[PDB]
Amino acid sequence: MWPSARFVDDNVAFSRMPTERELDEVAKDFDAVVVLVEEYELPYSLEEWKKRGVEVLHSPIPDFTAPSLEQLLEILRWIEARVREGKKVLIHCMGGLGRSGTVAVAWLMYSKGLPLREALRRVRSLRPGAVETYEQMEVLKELEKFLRS
Numbered sequence: 001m002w003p004s005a006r007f008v009d010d011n012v013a014f015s016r017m018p019t020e021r022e023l024d025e026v027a028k029d030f031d032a033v034v035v036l037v038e039e040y041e042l043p044y045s046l047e048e049w050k051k052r053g054v055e056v057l058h059s060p061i062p063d064f065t066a067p068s069l070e071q072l073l074e075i076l077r078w079i080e081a082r083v084r085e086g087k088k089v090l091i092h093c094m095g096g097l098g099r100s101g102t103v104a105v106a107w108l109m110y111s112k113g114l115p116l117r118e119a120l121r122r123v124r125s126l127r128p129g130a131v132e133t134y135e136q137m138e139v140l141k142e143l144e145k146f147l148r149s
């Protein structure tokens with residue numbers, strides 16, 4: 001089991017970026033991956049996942065930035081479709097955990113219906129670094145507004 005990952009539920013985990021020598025480790029444990037980092041900051045081609053039979057969502061988010069709400073909902077519908085199929089899903093950015101922590105928090109709100117204050121508490125209990133910037137928090141507040149309506 002790849003110990004840098006942290007699970008927010010049975011099926012969805014978030015982590016820093018796996019390096020090349022960790023790809024098999026992660027392919028063993030995860031069937032799908034959400035890559036939040038721009039192609040240019042990758043030390044390998046995302047075809048490394050395809051050759052291992054891992055499904056990839058590449059939805060880049062700039063460093064220290066938040067996704068739009070539209071981008072965040074697309075990501076959540078995709079994770080949901082993967083978990084539906086019985087796959088386990090790893091979310092990662094670089095090292096910061098701002099972006100990945102944001103998506104982790106959102107997954108709890110989207111899938112389990114947690115209020116933002118509790119989902120944020122859970123994720124930050126896992127990684128004190130999760131959700132680093134005010135725009136990240138704000139897009140989560142926007143998501144909550146969206147779901148309650």
Ligand code: VO4
Nearest residue numbers: 063064096098099
């Ligand atoms: O660029 V971050 O994913 O540490 O907000």
